[PDB]
Amino acid sequence: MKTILSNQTVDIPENVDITLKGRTVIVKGPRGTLRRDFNHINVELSLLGKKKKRLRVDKWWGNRKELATVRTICSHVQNMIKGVTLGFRYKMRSVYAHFPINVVIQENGSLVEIRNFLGEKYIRRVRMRPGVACSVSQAQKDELILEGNDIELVSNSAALIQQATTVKNKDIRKFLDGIYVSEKGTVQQAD
Amino acid sequence: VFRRFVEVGRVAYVSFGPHAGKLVAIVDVIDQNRALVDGPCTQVRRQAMPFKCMQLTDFILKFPHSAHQKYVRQAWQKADINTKWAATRWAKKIEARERKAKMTDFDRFKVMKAKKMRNRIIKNEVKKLQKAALLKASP
Amino acid sequence: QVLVLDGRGHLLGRLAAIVAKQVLLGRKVVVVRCEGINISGNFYRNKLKYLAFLRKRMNTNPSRGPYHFRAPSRIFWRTVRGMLPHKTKRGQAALDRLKVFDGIPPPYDKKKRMVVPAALKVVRLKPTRKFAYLGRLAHEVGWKYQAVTATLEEKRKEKAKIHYRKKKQLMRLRKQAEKNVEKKIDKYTEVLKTH
Amino acid sequence: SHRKFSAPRHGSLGFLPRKRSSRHRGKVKSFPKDDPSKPVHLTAFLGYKAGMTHIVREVDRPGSKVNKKEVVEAVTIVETPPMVVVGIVGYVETPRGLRTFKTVFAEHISDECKRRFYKNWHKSKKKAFTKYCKKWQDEDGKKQLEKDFSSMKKYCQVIRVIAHTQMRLLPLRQKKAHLMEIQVNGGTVAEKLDWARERLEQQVPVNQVFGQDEMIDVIGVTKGKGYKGVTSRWHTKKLPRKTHRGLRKVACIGAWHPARVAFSVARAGQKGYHHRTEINKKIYKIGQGYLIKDGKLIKNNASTDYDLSDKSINPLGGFVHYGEVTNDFVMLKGCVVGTKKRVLTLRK
Amino acid sequence: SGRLWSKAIFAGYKRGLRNQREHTALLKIEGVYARDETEFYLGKRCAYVYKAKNNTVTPGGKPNKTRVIWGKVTRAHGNSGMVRAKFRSNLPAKAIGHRIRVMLYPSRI
RNA sequence: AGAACUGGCGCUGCGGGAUGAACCGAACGCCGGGUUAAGGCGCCCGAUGCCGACGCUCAUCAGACCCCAGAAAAGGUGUU
RNA sequence: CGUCGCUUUUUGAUCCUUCGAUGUCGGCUCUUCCUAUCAUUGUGAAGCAGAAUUCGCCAAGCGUUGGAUUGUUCACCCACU
RNA sequence: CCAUCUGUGGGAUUAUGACUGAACGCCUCUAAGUCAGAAUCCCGCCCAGGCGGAACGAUACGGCAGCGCCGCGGAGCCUCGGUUGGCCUCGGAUAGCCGGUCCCCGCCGGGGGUCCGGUGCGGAGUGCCCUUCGUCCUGGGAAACGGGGCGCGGCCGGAAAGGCGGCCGCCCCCUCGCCCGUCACGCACCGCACGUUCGUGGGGAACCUGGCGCUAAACCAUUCGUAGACGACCUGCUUC
Ligand SMILES: [Mg+2]
Secondary structure: OOOOOEEEEEEOOOOOEEEEOOOEEEEEEOOEEEEEEOOOOOOEEEEEOOOOOEEEEEEOOOOHHHHOHHHHHHHHHHHHHHHHHOOEEEEEEEEOOOOOOEEEEOOOOOEEEEEOOOOOOOOEEEEOOOOEEEEEOOOOOOEEEEEEOOHHHHHHHHHHHHHHOOOOOOOOOOOOOEEEEEEEEOOOOOO | OOOOOOOOOEEEEEOOOOOOOEEEEEEEEOOOOEEEEEEOOOOEEEEEEEHHHEEEEEEEOOOOOOOOHHHHHHHHHHOOHHHHHHOOHHHHHHHHHHHHHOOOHHHHHHHHHHHHHHHHHHHHHHHHHHHHHHHHHOO | OOEEEEOOOEEHHHHHHHHHHHOOOOOOEEEEOOOOOEEEOOHHHHHHHHHHHHOOOOOOOOOOOOOOOOOHHHHHHHHHHOOOOOOOHHHHHHHHOEOOEOOOOOOOOOOOOEOOOOOEHHHHOOOOOOEEEHHHHHHHOOOOOOHHHHHHHHHHHHHHHHHHHHHHHHHHHHHHHOOOOOOHHHHHHHHHOOO | OOOOOOOOOOOOHHHOOOOOOOOOOOOOOOOOOOOOOOOOOOOEEEEEEEEEEEOOEEOOOOOOOOOOOEEOOEEEEEEOOOEEEEEEEEEEEEEOEEEEEEEEEOOOOOHHHHHHHOOOOOOOOOOOOOOOOHHHHOHHHHHOOOHHHHHHHHHOOEEEEEEEOOHHHOOOOOOOOOOEEEEOOOOOHHHHHHHHHOOOOOEEOOOOOOOOOOOEEEEEEOOOOEEEOHHHHOOOOOOOOOOOOOOOOOOOOOOOOOOOOOOOOOOOEEEOOOEEEOOOEOEEEEEOOOOOOOOOOOOOOOOOOOOOOOOOOOOOOOEOOOEOOOOOEEEEEOOOOOOOOEEEEEEO | OOOOOEEEEEEEEEEOOOOEEEEEEEEEEOOOOOOOOOHHHOOOEEEEEEEEEEEEOOOOOOOEEEEEEOEEEEEEEOOOOEEEEEEOOOOOOOOOOOEEEEOOOOOOO
8 A cells, every 4th residue: 555654652751761772772761771672673763852752653654564563663662661660560370289389489589490390300490581580479379470671571481480380291171280470560550 | 864855845856867967846746656846947847757766855945735837936036946056065066077077188187187296295294294193102 | 807795785696696797707706705695585484495405415325416515605606606607618717717705814804895786685675574694594504614703703893993993093184184285276176177 | 115014224324434444543533622611631542452351340320120239341451551742733713614723843752753754764764853853952943933832822722732652661563653633621722732831742641631430432443354245244134045146145236216226225345444433431440550660560450459469450361462561551341442452542 | 108998808709599600799898888888889990819829910020929800899789888899700719708909990089 | 089170290490488290480592781570688698787667476385478297176354 | 965186006098108028926135215194202172080092283203023824915813012 | 132332412493382562442472573392404423534725744965966945147948818006994774974072991992962974075986106208408386204125134913815014223325206387309110900017927948157055755575464355554674
């Protein structure tokens, strides 16, 4: 079709300041900073105006699979804005039958050492992506909490745990055992 | 990023084609790759030139959407594009590119003798600034 | 005498056909840094048809027969050979004017390198489509010299900064020197006829 | 077409050109990786296999049915007199592989090293290194000799060590040194290279390179058997007795339409004398041989903590086809490639 | 003192695909790479200079080992600045890729 | 396998279809210049090295030229 | 009940090639290839509780035997796997 | 296997499960961007080492001979091809280029504000020599390093194929190594081709020709048996 442009904008609150080197975006905020390069995605970005901080992503030329990626851009900025002010917290809970899951942390809140999963002798050590924090819950049974700024480093690491607790050579519809994610939240609440 | 657009009234240079080397005024974009243009004060009349033919310049003209030749003629010489186009650094480069093409054999000799002269002058002078640059760094 | 082609950013087939014609016309052509030649189509696609190339193997003894080269220099060399009449002695002599080098050797690191804008990826592919590097489909297929080459590139390119850093030192100087004019009698005739 | 009965391949195609190998001394195809943090050390060593005996050891392996009992094991013993380091080779890497940078040899080299550099030592005037020794002592040749270690230290990334064997200490009639070139895999290259200038023309024992119960590899050239037929070279099934023109032959050496004899078929040629590398041969004992004459040399090999005799590992009557061992030795569990009196390079 | 001739390589014989024609050569005169700008070189005498081991000259007073085959530029050949020339003998096919020597002689400029 | 009608091959080369009995151009004394048919013009391989026009399509088995040398029903929120 | 295909390991149909000759069944022996996968790796689905099975996916790396009868290919049986 | 011993790990990923996430305001493993993933695949380990290369040793006396290196002039023999060199940033492409005050890496590099330019003119559509016919007379402008070298001495840079480059002190020497102007001369060979360079090229044979050096080793024959069809292969041969 080759339409004339589309554009979404992303409003920026005051404690976070987005600066851009190009199609690379640098996001500094209160609880750290993080950056993403979009040198594959063929769009211009424009932060415009002092004292209000609006980011304008627009694509002038394009087709229907090139128009679909202008929202994917602006929805990745809002995960960089939300994660650098609030952060991400994926609470996940252990579900077990007869055998209780023994889950500890070896290395400074990075390595996760899972044993006594389904009565097996084999420990399952999970080393995580750099930028998340491991923490066994308090005032709750068998809950594991991951905290960090960047969603794709939180969420991929929360996927490695759930994938490691995979029941093999069995009926997966019974034998419902695993450390499944149960909540998608923030580190700081209600801002 | 994208500091100059096409637009109703945008002055464009025409690089190749049947009107190669003349300015035009973009009047109406017609479909996606073809634009209605004219130049009333630069000897190119009204037609649809393709966009890959043209070169965007940085002069805009505030005339209405798809007017006649007359109002574009008024806006061309109210804004006085032709003196502003001569007094730019890019039409000096296309002026300079044709002066070098019509350089005769006798002038090309005279350029050669006056080129190899002044490059002696700088080389016998740029050596002096090297000579004083170590003389700072020797104490 | 001899032209020197930097090979990165170029396409495999678009560059090697232009090398194949310029080498039939008597020139001596040297393509340098043929590690980063791009090749169209995504990487898993092009890695398939190179693995299909590896099993084209004569049954009775694979020692004689198809010689699968794996360095991206000889990948590029073999592409030129299929666009030459190499079974004739005019096509044999055409290959002897081609000398292809991976990385940048020291006879050819201080020359000025040329590019072919016919064959560039920036020119010729639509930017929203995927391409493959010849360096890492060589590395995926038995080329065991990627690390020892990419070490010698950054040893090469670090020595090339300190040359260019001091070059723009030199031409800041002869531009500061030509401010000290004293010569505008000679500046008449060049600006008159394109300085 | 579809054989009716599946059998596997006779022989391995991984060792295919069953060729007389181009070397009598085994070449190390690939040295062990070297890291700067680990101490500085050699990696291989030359030895001469002398024969086999067996042994009696107390096994200790929990879980098995043998645990805490006596087991006999067949062991080979390899007489390894201490090597003498002679030269230092550096290798700088290219994108065409490793390349020899340059070599520096010792000041005065031995006489049995020089015997390696000649195919006719008797008809010779022995003139090797006579002009190369004079540069260690003439000072103009010396202040550039130290220059070639500093350019060695700067550029090349893996350095090795040229050593040879002391063939004066063996009962063989050979007297030519076997000149090997082995790799120092220690720390960084400056400590790796000052570790070799310090010990040119000095001996390197075997217990300094290897250790007890430190599992190594044997590299050798196999027992050469000559030009032998199909059923012995490849262990192919013999034909039944009634067969005209021949029993011990492979019958069908291929189909019709490939129309050529394949490489993958078994036929007659040279068996043995091939280069092979064994993997995972355990060391049992590093013995030392035939010490001082102050009181007595002391034979005292093969005297374990339960035997306590004046034994020595050379058996009663001397080794068959080898001689009588007077040197430092290594004993290795299992069979080991080669005839007796044959060079084979032990390697980590 | 200096070069009074423009450089050109002998690219091949005029040919179809299978059969080739020996009587007409074709050239790639250097620096000219379009059919519109080849009109200068038409009619120009062009030469193929080579060596042997016996001797001949016309003007030099002593015969040297250099000898030559003359010939002239006939017409244009396709859209890309090629040029076909018809010499007085045929080129020996040793000359493929080697230069020839295109003079400026029969001048209308 | 067997008929009809016209042409062809057999008796017949040449250009094009990579290769070829019959297909498409086209028929032949020995040559020079000119031009074309059928076919083509990234490089083998003569000629697009045109600032060619407009769209369509991404394949982890793409596709690519009469005869002609490989495929169907059915299905696809893949795009148009 | 229909109906659309593929393959040339069956048999036909054909008679183009070989009648101044291409040695004609099977077995033995040995190599290599194909996948339309029996097992083995990693998986998805069951009317998958477990165990055993069954249906599908990437997949030909590796294996797929010993005998009684019979010229047998095929068949049938004993036994292991 | 009728005795004994040994048999070796990485990468990208297939199937498939997923991550964020649009298209389609939600959803969704996908469209761009990610993760895990295997008897398959490629490599390692291992077997052979290319009309593929390195590094190093030794380089022929005797009695006349002989052989390298450097410095040479002198001819003829054989193979021909070219007619000025560019001596270097990295790269990006919905982007880059130059100059720049301020705070950080043993008197140099990392950053940001600022100023420029940009169908790139600090433009290989370009740049430097140059289209140098020579010299003499003879003035202006430009320039006080001289520039070639058989110079001698010195340094230190460039290992991926360094086989090249930069700097310095003395020196027979030039003080005409440029641009404009004055003066008159040279083969002015009588209209004409292969001219003009790289080039005192490449390769071989010899001779008059200065200095500096150098004084071996392969193969056979003999022996060995770690080897063997034969060749090949591994070895010995001192007046102790
Ligand atoms: Mg190796």
